[PDB]
Amino acid sequence: ISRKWEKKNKIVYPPQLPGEPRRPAEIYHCRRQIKYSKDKMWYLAKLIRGMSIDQALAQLEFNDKKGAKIIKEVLLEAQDMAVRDHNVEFRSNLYIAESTSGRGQCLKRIRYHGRGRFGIMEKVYCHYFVKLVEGPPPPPEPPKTAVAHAKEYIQQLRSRTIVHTL
Amino acid sequence: TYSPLPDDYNCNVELALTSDGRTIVCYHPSVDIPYEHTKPIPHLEEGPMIEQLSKMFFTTKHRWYPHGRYHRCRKNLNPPKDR
Amino acid sequence: LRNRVTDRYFRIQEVLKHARHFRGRKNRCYRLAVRTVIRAFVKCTKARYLKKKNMRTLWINRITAASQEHGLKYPALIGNLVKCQVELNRKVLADLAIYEPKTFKSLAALASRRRHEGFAAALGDGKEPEGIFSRVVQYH
Amino acid sequence: VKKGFRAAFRFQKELERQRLLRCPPPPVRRSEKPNWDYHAEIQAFGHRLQENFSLDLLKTAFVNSCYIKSEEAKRQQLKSNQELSEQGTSFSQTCLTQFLEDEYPDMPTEGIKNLVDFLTGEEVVCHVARNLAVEQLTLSEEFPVPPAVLQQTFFAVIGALLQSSGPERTALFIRDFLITQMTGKELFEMWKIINPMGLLVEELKKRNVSAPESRLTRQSGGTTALPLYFVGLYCDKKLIAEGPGETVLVAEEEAARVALRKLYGFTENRRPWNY
Amino acid sequence: RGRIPGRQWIGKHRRPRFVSLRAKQNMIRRLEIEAENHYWLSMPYMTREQERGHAAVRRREAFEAIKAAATSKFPPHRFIADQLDHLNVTKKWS
Amino acid sequence: TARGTPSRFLASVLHNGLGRYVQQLQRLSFSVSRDGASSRGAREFVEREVIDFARRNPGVVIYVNSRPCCVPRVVAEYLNGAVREESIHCKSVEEISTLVQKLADQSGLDVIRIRKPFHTDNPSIQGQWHPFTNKPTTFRGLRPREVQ
Amino acid sequence: SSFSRAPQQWATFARIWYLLDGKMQPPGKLAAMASIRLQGLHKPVYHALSDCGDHVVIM
Numbered sequence: 001i002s003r004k005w006e007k008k009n010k011i012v013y014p015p016q017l018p019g020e021p022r023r024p025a026e027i028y029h030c031r032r033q034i035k036y037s038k039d040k041m042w043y044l045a046k047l048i049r050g051m052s053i054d055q056a057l058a059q060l061e062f063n064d065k066k067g068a069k070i071i072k073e074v075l076l077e078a079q080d081m082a083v084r085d086h087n088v089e090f091r092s093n094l095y096i097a098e099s100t101s102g103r104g105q106c107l108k109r110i111r112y113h114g115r116g117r118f119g120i121m122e123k124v125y126c127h128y129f130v131k132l133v134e135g136p137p138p139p140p141e142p143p144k145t146a147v148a149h150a151k152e153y154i155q156q157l158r159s160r161t162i163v164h165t166l
Numbered sequence: 167t168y169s170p171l172p173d174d175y176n177c178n179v180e181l182a183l184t185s186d187g188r189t190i191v192c193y194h195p196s197v198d199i200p201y202e203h204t205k206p207i208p209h210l211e212e213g214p215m216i217e218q219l220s221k222m223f224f225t226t227k228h229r230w231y232p233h234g235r236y237h238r239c240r241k242n243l244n245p246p247k248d249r
Numbered sequence: 250l251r252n253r254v255t256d257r258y259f260r261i262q263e264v265l266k267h268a269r270h271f272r273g274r275k276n277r278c279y280r281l282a283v284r285t286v287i288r289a290f291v292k293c294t295k296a297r298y299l300k301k302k303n304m305r306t307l308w309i310n311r312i313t314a315a316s317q318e319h320g321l322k323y324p325a326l327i328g329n330l331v332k333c334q335v336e337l338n339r340k341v342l343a344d345l346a347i348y349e350p351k352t353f354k355s356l357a358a359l360a361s362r363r364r365h366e367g368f369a370a371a372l373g374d375g376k377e378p379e380g381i382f383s384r385v386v387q388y389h
Numbered sequence: 390v391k392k393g394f395r396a397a398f399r400f401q402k403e404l405e406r407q408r409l410l411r412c413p414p415p416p417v418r419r420s421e422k423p424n425w426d427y428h429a430e431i432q433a434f435g436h437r438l439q440e441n442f443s444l445d446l447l448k449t450a451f452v453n454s455c456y457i458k459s460e461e462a463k464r465q466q467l468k469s470n471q472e473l474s475e476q477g478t479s480f481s482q483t484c485l486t487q488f489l490e491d492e493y494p495d496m497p498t499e500g501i502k503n504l505v506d507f508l509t510g511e512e513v514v515c516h517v518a519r520n521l522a523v524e525q526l527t528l529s530e531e532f533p534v535p536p537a538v539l540q541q542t543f544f545a546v547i548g549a550l551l552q553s554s555g556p557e558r559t560a561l562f563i564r565d566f567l568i569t570q571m572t573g574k575e576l577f578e579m580w581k582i583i584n585p586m587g588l589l590v591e592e593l594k595k596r597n598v599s600a601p602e603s604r605l606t607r608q609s610g611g612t613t614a615l616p617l618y619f620v621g622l623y624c625d626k627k628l629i630a631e632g633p634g635e636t637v638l639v640a641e642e643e644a645a646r647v648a649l650r651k652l653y654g655f656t657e658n659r660r661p662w663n664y
Numbered sequence: 665r666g667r668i669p670g671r672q673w674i675g676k677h678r679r680p681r682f683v684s685l686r687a688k689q690n691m692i693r694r695l696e697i698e699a700e701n702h703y704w705l706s707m708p709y710m711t712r713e714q715e716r717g718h719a720a721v722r723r724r725e726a727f728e729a730i731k732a733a734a735t736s737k738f739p740p741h742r743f744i745a746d747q748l749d750h751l752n753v754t755k756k757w758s
Numbered sequence: 759t760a761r762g763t764p765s766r767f768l769a770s771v772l773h774n775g776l777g778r779y780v781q782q783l784q785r786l787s788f789s790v791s792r793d794g795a796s797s798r799g800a801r802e803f804v805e806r807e808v809i810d811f812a813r814r815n816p817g818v819v820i821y822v823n824s825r826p827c828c829v830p831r832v833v834a835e836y837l838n839g840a841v842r843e844e845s846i847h848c849k850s851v852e853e854i855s856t857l858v859q860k861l862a863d864q865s866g867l868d869v870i871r872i873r874k875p876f877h878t879d880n881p882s883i884q885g886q887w888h889p890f891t892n893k894p895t896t897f898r899g900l901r902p903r904e905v906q
Numbered sequence: 907s908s909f910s911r912a913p914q915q916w917a918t919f920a921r922i923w924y925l926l927d928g929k930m931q932p933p934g935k936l937a938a939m940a941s942i943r944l945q946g947l948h949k950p951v952y953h954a955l956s957d958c959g960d961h962v963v964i965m
C-alpha cells in the first residue's frame with residue numbers, strides 16, 4: 001500500500017520575507033476504504049473541481065446519491081481542520097484544486113450462477129483524495145474568441161517557412 | 167534587336183562569352199518600375215463564429231475546432247529557430 | 250530455480266524507451282510494442298529511398314514551375330543545360346530559382362537560345378556555322 | 390528473492406537518475422565540483438583562446454570586488470578588476486566604432502554607437518563569455534553570477550590582454566568574435582527606430598534630394614483579410630526602395646526601412662567582413 | 665462491372681495487355697545495337713588452327729598457381745609472444 | 759528514430775570558423791584505478807599517449823582521478839557545459855586514442871538528428887522569390903477588367 | 907533582398923487571386939492549369955505540408 005497523501009501535510013516551507021508575494025496555503029485530506037465504486041464518485045469529483053466549497057456543499061447534499069454523504073463529511077471536516085491547526089483565516093475563502101478517487105483493498109466472493117457455474121464477485125473499496133487551497137477560486141478560461149482564432153492562424157502563416165531548401 | 171525573352175518585367179538580361187569561349191557571363195540589372203505603372207494612395211456563439219471566420223479566411227471549419235490535450239502536450243514549446 | 254535472468258527489467262525498458270511516443274496500450278505493454286517497434290524500424294530503413302524519390306520528384310516540380318513562369322518546360326530545360334555543358338543537379342537548379350530568379354532567368358534564357366540553335370541545326374545538320382553556345386569543349 | 394546483485398546495482402543508478410530528474414539540486418560553481426585546479430585552468434584557458442601573458446594580470450581580471458567582500462567577511466567570521474574593465478571597454482568602444490565607420494561611412498554617429506552599445510551589452514557579451522567558459526573562472530558571491538558582473542570580468546580580460554599583447558592583437562580578438570555575432574541580425578532587429586519615413590525624409594534632405602512619395606505598385610487580397618501591398622518610394626519619378634507589408638502603412642514603413650539599409654550601405658547583399 | 669475470371673494473368677481468359685510505342689521504341693533499340701554487335705563479332709582476326717596453341721602456357725601456369733594455393737593449407741603459426749601477452753592483463757602500477 | 763529523437767538546425771558554437779579557431783573541448787576527466795584488469799587500456803593510454811595528447815593540445819586541460827573503480831570511465835565537458843560520458847571498459851589503447859581524438863575534434867552539442875546538412879546565415883542574394891517577380895505591370899496601374 | 911524577416915516571409919508564402927474567362931474553352935484545360943495553381947505548384951517554394959495554395963476565379 002501507500003499513504004504519501006498524509007505525509008504531504010507534514011512538510012514545512014521556510015519563513016517568507018516581508019516584501020514578497022503572499023503564498024496561498026494549501027492543505028490535503030482524504031478518506032480511506034469507503035464503500036462506493038471508484039468511477040461513481042469520480043463523477044462527483046468532476047463536478048466539484050473548479051468552484052467554491054460552500055457553493056459545492058449545496059450541490060452534493062441536494063444530489064440524491066450515497067457518495068455525496070461520504071464526500072461531504074470529508075469536506076467540512078477538512079474545513080474545520082484547516083482553520084484549527086493549519087492557520088486558515090476564512091473557512092470559506094478557499095478553493096479545492098485536486099479532487100480524485102482511486103481503488104482500494106477489494107474483496108472477492110462467489111456468485112452462484114445457473115448450471116453449477118460460478119462467478120467471481122468483487123466488492124469495491126476506494127480511497128478519495130481532496131486538496132484545498134486558500135484564496136478565491138480561479139475563473140473559468142472562457143472559449144477562445146474570433147480574435148484568438150485569427151491571430152493564431154496568422155501566427156501559423158507567419159511562423160511557417162520554406163523547407164528542404166537553402 | 168532579337169531577344170530570347172521579354173526584358174520588361176524582371177531584369178534586362180544579356181549573355182556573353184569570353185573570346186576564347188570557355189566561360190559564359192550574364193548582366194541582369196533589375197527593372198525600374200515606371201511611375202505610370204502605379205496608383206495614387208487614398209456577442210456570438212460557436213456556430214456563427216466558426217463559419218464567418220471560415221468565410222473570412224477562405225478555409226474549412228475543421229481546423230478551427232479545439233484539439234485534445236494529447237496533441238496540446240505533444241506540441242513543442244521550444245522549437246528551434248533558423249537564422 | 251538456479252539460473253534466472255535478473256535484468257529482464259532493463260532489456261525491455263530500452264525497447265519501450267524508443268516506443269514511449271506510441272499511442273494506446275502499445276507504449277505501456279511489451280508485446281504490443283515488439284510487434285510495432287520492429288515494424289516502425291523496418292519502415293525507417295526503406296523510407297530513405299522514399300525520401301530520395303520524394304525529394305527528387307519535388308525538385309522536378311519546382312524547376313518545372315519556375316520554367317513555366319519564364320515560358321519553358323522542364324524536359325527541354327535540362328536538355329539545353331547538358332547540351333551547354335552545365336552539370337548542376339536538381340537541388341541547386343531548384344534552389345537557384347528560389348533566391349535569384351534573375352539568375353534562373355539567365356539559365357532559362359541560356360536554355361531557350363540553345364533550342365533555337367538546335368532547331369537551326371535540325372534544318373541544316375552540317376554545312377553551316379555551328380551554334381556559338383552549342384560549341385563544346387574537348388577534354389583529353 | 391532471486392539471487393544476484395548486479396541488476397540491483399544498476400537499478401539504483403536508474404533510481405537516483407530519476408530522483409535527479411524529479412528533484413534536481415541547484416547548480417554550483419565548477420570550483421565547488423570535483424576535478425578542479427585553479428592555476429592550471431586559467432593557464433589551460435589562456436592557451437585555448439591563443440593568449441599568453443602574466444598570471445598577475447589574468448588573476449586581477451578574473452577577481453571581482455564582490456568576492457573580496459565575502460572573502461574578508463568569512464575571514465573575520467585581493468585586487469579588483471575595475472581599472473582593467475575600464476580600459477578594456479574603453480578601447481573596445483573606440484575600436485568597434487573605428488572598424489564600423491571605416492566600413493560604413495554613411496552610418497551616422499548616433500545609430501552606429503547604439504549598435505556598439507548593443508554588442509557591448511549584457512545579453513551579447515555574457516552569451517559569448519558563457520560559451521567561452523569565463524563563468525567557470527570568474528568568482529563572485531552569488532551563483533549564477535549577475536550579467537553586469539560577468540560583463541565587467543569580460544572587459545577586464547580585454548584590458549589585461551591590451552596591456553600585455555597590444556592593440557593589434559586585442560583588435561584582432563574583439564573584431565573576430567563580436568562581428569561574427571553581428572552577421573546574423575540585421576540593423577533594425579537590435580537597433581529599433583521610430584518614425585522611419587520621418588527619419589528617411591530627414592536623411593534625404595541632408596543628401597540634397599526632394600521629398601519622396603509613397604505609391605502602391607502592386608496589390609493582392611485588398612478586401613480579403615490578408616491584405617498585401619508593394620509600396621515604393623519615388624523621388625523625381627525615380628525609385629530607391631520597395632517594401633511589402635500587410636497594410637498600406639506597414640508596406641510604407643517597410644519600404645522606408647528598405648531605403649535606409651541601402652542608404653547607409655547595410656544591405657543583406659553587401660560585402661561580408663574580410664579577414 | 666468489368667471483372668475477369670479468376671486471376672488477371674493466367675488461364676483460358678485473362679486481362680488482354682496491349683502494347684505502347686514506348687515499349688516498341690525500347691526493344692528496337694536493344695536489337696538494333698545487337699545488329700551492330702552482329703557486324704562486329706564477324707570478320708574474325710585469327711583462324712581456328714592459327715589460335716590453337718598460343719595461350720596453353722598461361723592456362724597451364726595459371727592452373728599450377730591454383731594447385732600451389734590449394735596445397736598451401738595448414739593451421740597458423742603459434743608463438744610464445746601472443747601466448748604470454750595474455751599475462752599482461754594484470755600489469756599494474758607500483 | 760527521427761520522430762522519437764529530438765532534432766535541431768545545424769549551427770556552430772559562436773561561429774568558430776571565421777575568427778581564430780579554438781579547440782571547443784574544455785576538459786577531460788579520466789577515472790582509472792590502480793587495480794582492475796579492465797583498466798589496462800586506460801593506464802597504458804595514460805603512459806604513452808596522454809602525455810603527447812597534452813603536448814599536442816595545450817588548450818585542453820586534463821584530470822586523472824586514479825581511484826578504485828570496477829569500471830574505468832572518461833568524462834568530457836565542453837565550453838557550453840554539455841557533459842558527455844563514454845565507457846572505455848575493456849578497450850584497446852588504439853581505440854582509446856581514436857576515441858579521445860574524435861572527442862577533441864567534436865564540439866559541445868548533443869549528437870542528434872540534424873534537420874538539414876548545412877546552415878546559411880545570408881542565403882538571399884538578388885532578392886528572394888515572391889509571386890510578383892516574374893510578371894509585368896499594367897499601364898496606369900489597373901487590375902484586369904477595371905475602367906478607372 | 908534587404909527585407910525584414912516577417913515581412914519577407916509573408917510576401918513569399920502569400921496568396922494571389924487569379925482570373926480566367928471561360929468563353930469557348932474546354933473544362934479540362936482550364937481545370938489543368940487551375941489545379942496546379944491551387945496547390946501552389948507554380949510557386950518554386952512548393953511543399954505539400956505548407957498550404958501555399960492560391961485562389962482562382964472563373965467566369
Ligand SMILES: [Mg+2]
Nearest residue numbers: 119120121122
Ligand atoms: Mg474475468
Ligand SMILES: [Mg+2]
Nearest residue numbers: 301302305306
Ligand atoms: Mg533516381
Ligand SMILES: [Mg+2]
Nearest residue numbers: 668669670671
Ligand atoms: Mg479474380
